[PDB]
Design an enzyme around this catalytic site. Structure first.
Site, short mmCIF file in Angstrom:
data_model
loop_
_atom_site.label_atom_id
_atom_site.label_comp_id
_atom_site.label_asym_id
_atom_site.label_seq_id
_atom_site.Cartn_x
_atom_site.Cartn_y
_atom_site.Cartn_z
N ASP A 154 0.84 -1.19 0.00
CA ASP A 154 0.00 0.00 0.00
C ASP A 154 0.89 1.26 0.00
O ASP A 154 2.11 1.16 -0.20
CB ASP A 154 -1.00 -0.02 1.17
CG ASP A 154 -0.32 -0.14 2.54
OD1 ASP A 154 -0.75 0.55 3.48
OD2 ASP A 154 0.63 -0.92 2.66
N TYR A 212 2.97 4.74 1.38
CA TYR A 212 3.65 5.26 2.59
C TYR A 212 2.64 5.88 3.59
O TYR A 212 1.66 6.51 3.18
CB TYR A 212 4.68 6.33 2.24
CG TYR A 212 5.88 5.90 1.43
CD1 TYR A 212 6.53 4.69 1.66
CD2 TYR A 212 6.39 6.74 0.45
CE1 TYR A 212 7.66 4.33 0.90
CE2 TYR A 212 7.49 6.38 -0.29
CZ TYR A 212 8.13 5.18 -0.07
OH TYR A 212 9.23 4.87 -0.83
N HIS A 213 2.91 5.72 4.89
CA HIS A 213 1.95 6.16 5.92
C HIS A 213 2.52 7.15 6.95
O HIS A 213 1.98 7.27 8.07
CB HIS A 213 1.34 4.95 6.65
CG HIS A 213 2.36 4.06 7.30
ND1 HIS A 213 3.27 4.52 8.23
CD2 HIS A 213 2.60 2.73 7.16
CE1 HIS A 213 4.02 3.51 8.63
NE2 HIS A 213 3.64 2.42 8.00
N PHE A 262 5.80 4.05 -3.89
CA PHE A 262 7.21 4.17 -3.48
C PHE A 262 7.81 5.56 -3.68
O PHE A 262 8.90 5.85 -3.17
CB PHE A 262 8.06 3.11 -4.18
CG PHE A 262 7.83 1.71 -3.68
CD1 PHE A 262 7.29 0.73 -4.52
CD2 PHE A 262 8.14 1.36 -2.37
CE1 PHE A 262 7.07 -0.56 -4.06
CE2 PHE A 262 7.93 0.07 -1.90
CZ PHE A 262 7.39 -0.89 -2.74
N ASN A 300 -0.06 0.53 -5.85
CA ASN A 300 -0.10 -0.44 -4.79
C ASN A 300 -1.43 -1.17 -4.81
O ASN A 300 -2.46 -0.60 -5.18
CB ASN A 300 0.16 0.21 -3.42
CG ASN A 300 1.53 0.87 -3.34
OD1 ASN A 300 2.55 0.24 -3.55
ND2 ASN A 300 1.53 2.17 -3.08
N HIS A 334 9.57 -7.61 -1.19
CA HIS A 334 9.28 -6.18 -1.14
C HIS A 334 10.50 -5.38 -0.67
O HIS A 334 11.12 -5.72 0.33
CB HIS A 334 8.09 -5.99 -0.19
CG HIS A 334 7.76 -4.58 0.15
ND1 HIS A 334 8.69 -3.69 0.65
CD2 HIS A 334 6.58 -3.91 0.13
CE1 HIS A 334 8.10 -2.53 0.89
NE2 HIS A 334 6.82 -2.64 0.59
N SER A 379 12.33 -6.75 4.81
CA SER A 379 12.29 -7.91 3.91
C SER A 379 13.44 -8.02 2.89
O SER A 379 14.05 -9.07 2.76
CB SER A 379 10.93 -7.97 3.19
OG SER A 379 10.68 -6.80 2.43
#
Length: 223
Positions: A64, A66-67, A77, A123, A187, A192
């Site tokens: 999804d 950026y938060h 991204f 996303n 990802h 990761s």
DNA sequence: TGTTATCTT
DNA sequence: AAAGATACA
């Protein structure tokens, strides 16, 4: 002009009336009354305002958006001057520095320059409640974005699909793996990236598959 | 350093 | 479902 580019509105407006979509547009409204949602309303579909749908050539699909504040701007991204590249973007550039030869750190995180050449930066899910990852998952985005993978899969050929993370990879079973080229991997996130992203050479393998197909290679330095 | 992804319960 | 345990800046 407005939130959707015309070429996509044309091939998406049919979701606009379906109940999962009335519902989801309602759901996120309630989120914005009660939390900060990223991106802000007008940036949610920036991934349409970059090129004609039929000019798309590569599809980079993420989890999804950026938060953290002032980050997610509709392009997966991507981040906008002033904003610095987040780890996931820092990482990306790392793969690019050793995967692609001429490529040097852009000095900024704005990825509009790719989506002009035909890279759909998307996303699976398009909104995120502040500071909580995947928080808007399973709310009706996945189905809408599926219309977006469906349509490409249907009305285009020799597209490179780049599926970043467990969640992006779920679209995979809907792509015609002969008609199109699906490159799947861990990802870009520091949580990761070692699971495969570094060493994945996804950028070079894309161009490779694009030239054999008469199409123009994506110029990744063009940012 | 903080990553907030992914595998597993 | 939701959450605990787990290699580079």
């Amino acid at each position: 002009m407005e939130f959707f580019g015309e070429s996509w509105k044309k091939h998406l407006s049919g979701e606009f009336g379906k109940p999962y979509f009335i519902k989801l547009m309602g759901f996120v409204a309630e989120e914005r009354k009660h939390y900060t949602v990223y991106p802000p309303p007008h940036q949610v579909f920036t991934w349409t305002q970059m090129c004609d749908i039929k000019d798309v050539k590569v599809v980079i699909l993420g989890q999804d958006p950026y938060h953290g504040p002032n980050q997610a701007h509709g392009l997966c991204f991507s981040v906008q001057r002033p904003v610095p590249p987040p780890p996931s973007l820092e990482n990306i550039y790392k793969e690019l520095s050793t995967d692609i030869e001429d490529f040097v750190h852009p000095g900024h995180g704005d990825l509009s320059g790719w989506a002009k050449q035909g890279v759909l930066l998307l996303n699976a899910v398009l909104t995120v409640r502040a500071h909580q990852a995947n928080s808007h998952k399973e709310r009706g985005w996945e189905q809408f974005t599926d219309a977006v993978v469906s349509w490409l899969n249907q009305n285009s050929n020799g597209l490179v699909f780049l599926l970043w993370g467990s969640y992006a990879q779920k679209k995979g079973s809907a792509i015609d793996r002969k008609r199109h080229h699906v490159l799947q991997t861990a990802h870009p996130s520091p949580l990761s990236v070692y699971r495969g992203f570094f060493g994945c050479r996804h950028f070079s393998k894309t161009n490779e598959l694009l030239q054999k197909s008469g199409k123009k290679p994506i110029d990744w330095k063009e940012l």
